[PDB]
Design a protein around this nucleic acid. Structure first.
Ligand SMILES: C[S@@+](CC[C@H](N)C(=O)[O-])C[C@H]1O[C@@H](n2cnc3c(N)ncnc32)[C@H](O)[C@@H]1O
Length: 335
RNA sequence: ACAGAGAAGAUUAGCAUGGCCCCUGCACAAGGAUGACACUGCGACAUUG
Protein backbone atom coordinates (compact mmCIF):
# COMPACT_ATOMS: atom_id res chain seq x y z
CA UNK A 1 0.00 0.00 0.00
CA UNK A 2 2.63 2.55 1.02
CA UNK A 3 5.07 1.47 -1.70
CA UNK A 4 3.66 -1.55 -3.54
CA UNK A 5 -0.16 -1.49 -3.79
CA UNK A 6 0.14 -4.04 -6.64
CA UNK A 7 0.12 -7.87 -6.66
CA UNK A 8 1.08 -8.15 -10.34
CA UNK A 9 4.71 -9.09 -9.77
CA UNK A 10 5.39 -12.85 -10.08
CA UNK A 11 8.99 -12.24 -9.09
CA UNK A 12 7.96 -13.01 -5.51
CA UNK A 13 6.69 -16.42 -6.62
CA UNK A 14 9.84 -17.13 -8.58
CA UNK A 15 11.98 -16.08 -5.64
CA UNK A 16 10.20 -18.53 -3.45
CA UNK A 17 10.55 -21.33 -6.00
CA UNK A 18 14.25 -20.54 -6.12
CA UNK A 19 14.33 -20.95 -2.34
CA UNK A 20 12.52 -24.28 -2.69
CA UNK A 21 14.90 -25.55 -5.38
CA UNK A 22 17.95 -24.30 -3.48
CA UNK A 23 16.77 -26.26 -0.44
CA UNK A 24 15.50 -29.41 -2.19
CA UNK A 25 18.68 -29.61 -4.26
CA UNK A 26 20.73 -29.36 -1.05
CA UNK A 27 18.74 -31.35 1.55
CA UNK A 28 20.01 -34.89 1.02
CA UNK A 29 19.59 -37.58 3.67
CA UNK A 30 18.27 -34.94 6.09
CA UNK A 31 14.66 -35.43 7.16
CA UNK A 32 11.74 -33.16 6.27
CA UNK A 33 12.26 -31.10 9.41
CA UNK A 34 10.35 -27.97 10.33
CA UNK A 35 11.83 -25.18 8.20
CA UNK A 36 11.77 -21.61 9.50
CA UNK A 37 12.63 -18.62 7.31
CA UNK A 38 13.67 -15.00 7.75
CA UNK A 39 12.36 -12.09 5.68
CA UNK A 40 14.51 -9.02 6.26
CA UNK A 41 12.19 -6.35 4.97
CA UNK A 42 8.87 -8.09 5.38
CA UNK A 43 7.06 -4.88 4.43
CA UNK A 44 3.36 -4.09 4.60
CA UNK A 45 2.72 -6.97 2.18
CA UNK A 46 4.85 -9.77 3.68
CA UNK A 47 4.45 -11.61 0.40
CA UNK A 48 7.54 -13.73 1.00
CA UNK A 49 6.45 -15.53 4.22
CA UNK A 50 2.87 -15.86 2.98
CA UNK A 51 3.85 -17.59 -0.25
CA UNK A 52 6.56 -19.59 1.48
CA UNK A 53 3.84 -21.00 3.70
CA UNK A 54 1.00 -21.49 1.20
CA UNK A 55 3.39 -23.18 -1.24
CA UNK A 56 5.69 -25.42 0.80
CA UNK A 57 4.63 -25.02 4.47
CA UNK A 58 7.69 -23.18 5.72
CA UNK A 59 7.80 -21.05 8.86
CA UNK A 60 8.92 -17.45 8.82
CA UNK A 61 10.10 -14.49 10.89
CA UNK A 62 9.58 -11.00 9.50
CA UNK A 63 11.88 -8.17 10.61
CA UNK A 64 10.54 -4.71 9.79
CA UNK A 65 11.84 -1.17 10.41
CA UNK A 66 8.64 0.86 10.14
CA UNK A 67 5.77 0.98 12.63
CA UNK A 68 3.07 1.09 9.97
CA UNK A 69 4.62 -1.80 8.05
CA UNK A 70 4.93 -3.92 11.21
CA UNK A 71 1.28 -3.31 12.11
CA UNK A 72 0.14 -4.07 8.57
CA UNK A 73 2.15 -7.30 8.51
CA UNK A 74 0.53 -8.33 11.79
CA UNK A 75 -2.92 -7.71 10.32
CA UNK A 76 -2.05 -9.58 7.13
CA UNK A 77 -0.90 -12.66 9.02
CA UNK A 78 -3.87 -12.42 11.41
CA UNK A 79 -6.31 -12.74 8.52
CA UNK A 80 -4.12 -15.47 7.03
CA UNK A 81 -4.14 -17.93 9.97
CA UNK A 82 -0.36 -18.44 9.98
CA UNK A 83 -0.23 -16.88 13.46
CA UNK A 84 1.36 -20.15 14.58
CA UNK A 85 3.69 -20.31 11.56
CA UNK A 86 4.91 -16.73 10.98
CA UNK A 87 6.20 -14.14 13.44
CA UNK A 88 6.88 -10.42 12.97
CA UNK A 89 9.41 -8.20 14.74
CA UNK A 90 9.69 -4.40 14.83
CA UNK A 91 13.25 -3.13 15.05
CA UNK A 92 14.94 0.25 15.22
CA UNK A 93 17.16 1.61 12.46
CA UNK A 94 20.25 0.53 14.43
CA UNK A 95 19.37 -3.07 15.29
CA UNK A 96 21.22 -6.00 13.80
CA UNK A 97 19.26 -7.31 10.84
CA UNK A 98 19.38 -10.94 12.04
CA UNK A 99 17.07 -11.46 15.05
CA UNK A 100 17.85 -13.85 17.86
CA UNK A 101 16.38 -17.33 17.51
CA UNK A 102 14.55 -16.86 20.86
CA UNK A 103 14.79 -20.52 21.83
CA UNK A 104 13.54 -22.04 18.58
CA UNK A 105 15.73 -23.68 15.94
CA UNK A 106 18.05 -21.64 13.74
CA UNK A 107 16.55 -20.44 10.48
CA UNK A 108 17.10 -22.60 7.43
CA UNK A 109 17.36 -19.57 5.14
CA UNK A 110 17.56 -15.77 5.21
CA UNK A 111 16.06 -13.78 2.36
CA UNK A 112 15.74 -10.06 1.75
CA UNK A 113 15.04 -7.34 -0.81
CA UNK A 114 17.29 -4.44 0.16
CA UNK A 115 16.40 -0.76 -0.25
CA UNK A 116 17.81 0.70 -3.41
CA UNK A 117 18.34 4.45 -3.14
CA UNK A 118 20.78 6.82 -1.47
CA UNK A 119 19.30 10.34 -1.44
CA UNK A 120 15.95 12.03 -2.05
CA UNK A 121 17.69 14.31 -4.54
CA UNK A 122 18.80 11.16 -6.38
CA UNK A 123 15.23 9.86 -5.95
CA UNK A 124 13.93 12.84 -7.90
CA UNK A 125 16.84 12.89 -10.35
CA UNK A 126 16.25 9.31 -11.48
CA UNK A 127 12.51 8.64 -10.97
CA UNK A 128 10.38 10.23 -8.26
CA UNK A 129 7.08 9.31 -9.85
CA UNK A 130 4.18 10.18 -7.50
CA UNK A 131 4.13 7.30 -4.96
CA UNK A 132 12.73 5.15 5.56
CA UNK A 133 11.22 2.58 3.20
CA UNK A 134 13.37 3.13 0.08
CA UNK A 135 16.36 4.90 1.68
CA UNK A 136 19.61 3.48 3.01
CA UNK A 137 23.23 4.59 3.33
CA UNK A 138 24.84 2.92 0.33
CA UNK A 139 21.93 1.32 -1.49
CA UNK A 140 21.37 -2.34 -2.23
CA UNK A 141 25.13 -2.73 -1.95
CA UNK A 142 25.37 -1.15 1.50
CA UNK A 143 22.46 -3.20 2.82
CA UNK A 144 24.04 -6.33 1.35
CA UNK A 145 27.30 -5.35 3.04
CA UNK A 146 25.51 -5.16 6.38
CA UNK A 147 23.92 -8.57 5.81
CA UNK A 148 27.26 -10.05 4.77
CA UNK A 149 28.94 -8.59 7.86
CA UNK A 150 26.34 -10.02 10.24
CA UNK A 151 26.37 -13.38 8.43
CA UNK A 152 29.74 -14.21 9.98
CA UNK A 153 28.13 -14.54 13.41
CA UNK A 154 25.17 -16.73 12.35
CA UNK A 155 26.58 -19.50 10.17
CA UNK A 156 23.96 -22.07 11.17
CA UNK A 157 21.54 -20.51 8.70
CA UNK A 158 22.32 -22.53 5.60
CA UNK A 159 21.19 -20.37 2.67
CA UNK A 160 21.57 -16.60 2.79
CA UNK A 161 20.02 -14.88 -0.21
CA UNK A 162 19.80 -11.30 -1.44
CA UNK A 163 18.09 -9.72 -4.43
CA UNK A 164 19.81 -7.06 -6.54
CA UNK A 165 18.19 -4.66 -8.98
CA UNK A 166 21.18 -3.16 -10.80
CA UNK A 167 23.78 -5.12 -12.75
CA UNK A 168 26.54 -2.85 -11.43
CA UNK A 169 25.72 -4.18 -7.95
CA UNK A 170 26.80 -7.73 -8.82
CA UNK A 171 30.48 -6.78 -9.37
CA UNK A 172 30.76 -5.06 -5.98
CA UNK A 173 28.90 -7.58 -3.82
CA UNK A 174 30.44 -10.57 -5.58
CA UNK A 175 33.85 -8.93 -5.11
CA UNK A 176 33.21 -8.62 -1.38
CA UNK A 177 32.03 -12.24 -1.29
CA UNK A 178 35.29 -13.27 -2.93
CA UNK A 179 37.15 -11.09 -0.42
CA UNK A 180 35.53 -13.04 2.43
CA UNK A 181 36.22 -16.35 0.63
CA UNK A 182 32.62 -17.52 0.29
CA UNK A 183 33.07 -20.25 -2.31
CA UNK A 184 29.50 -21.60 -2.31
CA UNK A 185 27.44 -18.78 -3.76
CA UNK A 186 25.35 -18.30 -6.84
CA UNK A 187 23.76 -15.89 -9.30
CA UNK A 188 20.29 -16.59 -10.66
CA UNK A 189 19.16 -14.36 -13.52
CA UNK A 190 15.42 -13.76 -13.71
CA UNK A 191 13.33 -12.24 -16.50
CA UNK A 192 10.16 -10.13 -16.52
CA UNK A 193 9.54 -8.51 -19.88
CA UNK A 194 12.68 -6.40 -20.12
CA UNK A 195 13.61 -6.23 -16.42
CA UNK A 196 16.28 -8.51 -14.95
CA UNK A 197 17.22 -9.38 -11.37
CA UNK A 198 20.11 -11.11 -9.61
CA UNK A 199 19.65 -13.41 -6.62
CA UNK A 200 23.16 -13.63 -5.17
CA UNK A 201 22.69 -16.41 -2.64
CA UNK A 202 25.58 -17.55 -0.48
CA UNK A 203 26.05 -20.32 2.06
CA UNK A 204 28.72 -21.37 4.52
CA UNK A 205 27.84 -25.07 4.15
CA UNK A 206 28.95 -27.88 1.86
CA UNK A 207 25.78 -28.57 -0.14
CA UNK A 208 26.05 -27.30 -3.73
CA UNK A 209 22.88 -26.76 -5.76
CA UNK A 210 22.29 -27.36 -9.46
CA UNK A 211 24.00 -25.33 -12.17
CA UNK A 212 20.72 -23.86 -13.39
CA UNK A 213 20.53 -22.13 -10.01
CA UNK A 214 24.04 -20.69 -9.59
CA UNK A 215 25.43 -20.12 -13.10
CA UNK A 216 23.19 -18.16 -15.49
CA UNK A 217 23.32 -19.19 -19.12
CA UNK A 218 24.27 -15.77 -20.47
CA UNK A 219 28.01 -15.10 -20.19
CA UNK A 220 27.68 -11.33 -19.64
CA UNK A 221 28.85 -11.65 -16.02
CA UNK A 222 31.12 -14.59 -16.83
CA UNK A 223 33.83 -13.17 -14.56
CA UNK A 224 31.44 -13.36 -11.59
CA UNK A 225 30.07 -16.89 -12.00
CA UNK A 226 30.62 -19.41 -9.21
CA UNK A 227 32.43 -22.66 -9.88
CA UNK A 228 30.98 -25.36 -12.11
CA UNK A 229 28.87 -28.15 -10.61
CA UNK A 230 27.86 -30.23 -13.64
CA UNK A 231 30.07 -31.42 -16.51
CA UNK A 232 28.13 -33.31 -19.18
CA UNK A 233 29.50 -35.52 -21.97
CA UNK A 234 27.93 -36.94 -25.13
CA UNK A 235 28.22 -40.64 -25.90
CA UNK A 236 28.25 -42.96 -28.92
CA UNK A 237 26.63 -46.39 -29.29
CA UNK A 238 29.61 -48.55 -28.24
CA UNK A 239 29.99 -46.43 -25.11
CA UNK A 240 26.20 -46.26 -24.78
CA UNK A 241 26.49 -50.04 -24.47
CA UNK A 242 29.62 -50.45 -22.33
CA UNK A 243 28.88 -47.45 -20.06
CA UNK A 244 28.09 -49.51 -16.96
CA UNK A 245 31.22 -51.65 -17.28
CA UNK A 246 33.43 -48.62 -17.96
CA UNK A 247 32.06 -46.77 -14.93
CA UNK A 248 32.53 -49.89 -12.81
CA UNK A 249 36.16 -50.35 -13.84
CA UNK A 250 36.88 -46.63 -13.42
CA UNK A 251 35.37 -46.33 -9.96
CA UNK A 252 36.81 -49.63 -8.73
CA UNK A 253 40.35 -49.44 -10.12
CA UNK A 254 41.01 -46.03 -8.54
CA UNK A 255 40.20 -46.99 -4.91
CA UNK A 256 37.14 -44.74 -5.09
CA UNK A 257 34.29 -45.36 -2.60
CA UNK A 258 30.91 -45.64 -4.28
CA UNK A 259 27.48 -47.26 -4.13
CA UNK A 260 24.47 -47.38 -6.41
CA UNK A 261 21.21 -45.55 -5.67
CA UNK A 262 18.59 -47.11 -7.92
CA UNK A 263 18.68 -45.21 -11.21
CA UNK A 264 21.60 -42.96 -10.12
CA UNK A 265 25.21 -43.92 -9.39
CA UNK A 266 26.86 -42.24 -6.40
CA UNK A 267 30.26 -41.62 -4.84
CA UNK A 268 31.57 -40.60 -1.43
CA UNK A 269 35.15 -39.36 -1.47
CA UNK A 270 37.17 -38.35 1.58
CA UNK A 271 40.39 -37.80 -0.40
CA UNK A 272 41.38 -37.50 -4.06
CA UNK A 273 42.43 -41.03 -5.06
CA UNK A 274 42.37 -40.60 -8.86
CA UNK A 275 44.93 -37.83 -9.37
CA UNK A 276 48.50 -38.69 -10.24
CA UNK A 277 49.53 -37.11 -6.94
CA UNK A 278 47.33 -39.66 -5.16
CA UNK A 279 49.13 -42.69 -6.60
CA UNK A 280 52.54 -41.04 -6.17
CA UNK A 281 51.90 -40.21 -2.50
CA UNK A 282 50.57 -43.71 -1.86
CA UNK A 283 53.66 -45.15 -3.58
CA UNK A 284 56.12 -42.73 -1.91
CA UNK A 285 56.90 -42.88 1.81
CA UNK A 286 55.45 -39.58 3.06
CA UNK A 287 53.78 -38.52 6.30
CA UNK A 288 50.57 -37.46 4.53
CA UNK A 289 48.50 -40.39 3.26
CA UNK A 290 45.56 -38.56 1.66
CA UNK A 291 44.93 -35.50 -0.49
CA UNK A 292 42.24 -33.75 1.50
CA UNK A 293 38.96 -32.49 0.12
CA UNK A 294 35.61 -34.23 0.48
CA UNK A 295 33.18 -34.77 -2.37
CA UNK A 296 29.81 -36.28 -3.16
CA UNK A 297 28.63 -36.46 -6.75
CA UNK A 298 26.32 -38.52 -8.92
CA UNK A 299 27.16 -40.07 -12.30
CA UNK A 300 23.95 -40.71 -14.23
CA UNK A 301 23.35 -41.81 -17.83
CA UNK A 302 20.53 -40.34 -19.92
CA UNK A 303 20.26 -40.89 -23.69
CA UNK A 304 23.86 -41.08 -24.96
CA UNK A 305 25.22 -38.85 -22.22
CA UNK A 306 26.90 -38.83 -18.81
CA UNK A 307 26.55 -36.27 -16.05
CA UNK A 308 28.89 -35.51 -13.15
CA UNK A 309 26.82 -33.33 -10.82
CA UNK A 310 28.41 -32.03 -7.62
CA UNK A 311 26.36 -32.50 -4.45
CA UNK A 312 28.86 -31.75 -1.65
CA UNK A 313 32.25 -30.26 -0.85
CA UNK A 314 34.01 -27.00 -0.05
CA UNK A 315 36.72 -27.45 -2.71
CA UNK A 316 36.48 -27.17 -6.49
CA UNK A 317 39.84 -28.86 -7.16
CA UNK A 318 38.42 -32.27 -6.26
CA UNK A 319 35.45 -31.82 -8.58
CA UNK A 320 37.57 -30.62 -11.50
CA UNK A 321 40.09 -33.44 -11.04
CA UNK A 322 37.35 -36.07 -10.95
CA UNK A 323 35.71 -34.56 -14.04
CA UNK A 324 38.92 -34.60 -16.05
CA UNK A 325 39.76 -38.16 -14.97
CA UNK A 326 36.29 -39.28 -16.03
CA UNK A 327 36.62 -37.55 -19.41
CA UNK A 328 39.87 -39.40 -20.06
CA UNK A 329 38.17 -42.62 -18.94
CA UNK A 330 35.51 -42.11 -21.61
CA UNK A 331 38.16 -41.28 -24.22
CA UNK A 332 40.28 -44.38 -23.50
CA UNK A 333 37.24 -46.62 -24.11
CA UNK A 334 35.40 -44.94 -26.98
CA UNK A 335 38.42 -45.54 -29.22
C1' A B 1 3.36 4.82 -11.43
C1' C B 2 9.14 4.39 -8.13
C1' A B 3 15.08 -0.84 -8.77
C1' G B 4 19.39 -2.87 -16.43
C1' A B 5 20.12 -0.40 -20.75
C1' G B 6 19.78 4.46 -19.68
C1' A B 7 26.80 2.09 -21.29
C1' A B 8 30.77 1.09 -20.86
C1' G B 9 31.68 -0.58 -25.43
C1' A B 10 30.69 -5.38 -25.51
C1' U B 11 30.16 -10.68 -27.51
C1' U B 12 32.46 -13.64 -30.88
C1' A B 13 36.34 -15.94 -35.02
C1' G B 14 41.03 -16.03 -32.74
C1' C B 15 46.35 -15.60 -30.32
C1' A B 16 48.22 -15.75 -25.66
C1' U B 17 47.67 -16.87 -19.88
C1' G B 18 46.09 -20.20 -15.94
C1' G B 19 44.98 -24.42 -13.53
C1' C B 20 42.81 -30.07 -14.55
C1' C B 21 43.32 -35.38 -16.50
C1' C B 22 47.94 -38.37 -18.88
C1' C B 23 52.99 -39.51 -19.38
C1' U B 24 58.03 -38.67 -17.40
C1' G B 25 60.08 -37.51 -12.42
C1' C B 26 61.50 -38.44 -4.94
C1' A B 27 60.19 -33.65 -3.89
C1' C B 28 59.81 -29.10 -5.67
C1' A B 29 60.48 -27.13 -9.85
C1' A B 30 61.41 -28.95 -14.78
C1' G B 31 59.40 -30.97 -19.93
C1' G B 32 56.26 -33.18 -23.58
C1' A B 33 51.72 -34.64 -25.20
C1' U B 34 46.82 -34.25 -25.53
C1' G B 35 41.93 -32.51 -24.74
C1' A B 36 37.89 -31.80 -21.29
C1' C B 37 37.83 -26.62 -18.86
C1' A B 38 38.24 -20.60 -16.99
C1' C B 39 36.71 -15.96 -11.18
C1' U B 40 43.34 -14.02 -16.38
C1' G B 41 44.90 -10.90 -20.46
C1' C B 42 45.03 -8.37 -26.26
C1' G B 43 41.11 -8.14 -30.18
C1' A B 44 43.55 -10.07 -37.61
C1' C B 45 37.33 -9.68 -37.73
C1' A B 46 31.94 -9.53 -38.10
C1' U B 47 27.16 -7.45 -36.64
C1' U B 48 24.18 -4.74 -33.50
C1' G B 49 20.60 -2.02 -29.63
C1 LIG C 1 12.31 -2.83 -1.10
S1 LIG C 1 11.71 -2.95 0.58
C2 LIG C 1 11.43 -4.73 0.76
C3 LIG C 1 9.93 -4.95 0.74
C4 LIG C 1 9.50 -6.34 0.25
N1 LIG C 1 9.58 -6.42 -1.24
C5 LIG C 1 8.07 -6.63 0.70
O1 LIG C 1 7.71 -7.82 0.74
O2 LIG C 1 7.36 -5.64 0.99
C6 LIG C 1 13.20 -2.74 1.57
C7 LIG C 1 12.96 -3.19 3.00
O3 LIG C 1 14.15 -2.98 3.79
C8 LIG C 1 13.73 -2.97 5.13
N2 LIG C 1 14.76 -2.40 5.98
C9 LIG C 1 15.60 -1.36 5.69
N3 LIG C 1 16.42 -1.06 6.67
C10 LIG C 1 16.08 -1.95 7.68
C11 LIG C 1 16.57 -2.14 8.98
N4 LIG C 1 17.55 -1.41 9.52
N5 LIG C 1 16.01 -3.11 9.73
C12 LIG C 1 15.02 -3.84 9.19
N6 LIG C 1 14.48 -3.76 7.98
C13 LIG C 1 15.06 -2.78 7.27
C14 LIG C 1 12.43 -2.17 5.13
O4 LIG C 1 11.61 -2.61 6.18
C15 LIG C 1 11.84 -2.47 3.74
O5 LIG C 1 10.68 -3.28 3.87
Amino acid sequence: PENRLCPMVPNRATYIRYIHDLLSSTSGQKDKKRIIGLDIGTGASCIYPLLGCRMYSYDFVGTEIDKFSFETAKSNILQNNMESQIKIVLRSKQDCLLPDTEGMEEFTFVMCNPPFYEHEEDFINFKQNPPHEMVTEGGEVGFANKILTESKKRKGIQWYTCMFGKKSSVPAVVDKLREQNISNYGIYELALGKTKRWIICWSFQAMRPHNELIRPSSTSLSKYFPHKVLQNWTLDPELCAQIDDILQKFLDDNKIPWSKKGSVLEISTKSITWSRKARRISKSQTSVSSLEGQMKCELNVIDNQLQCKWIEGYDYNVYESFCSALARALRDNKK
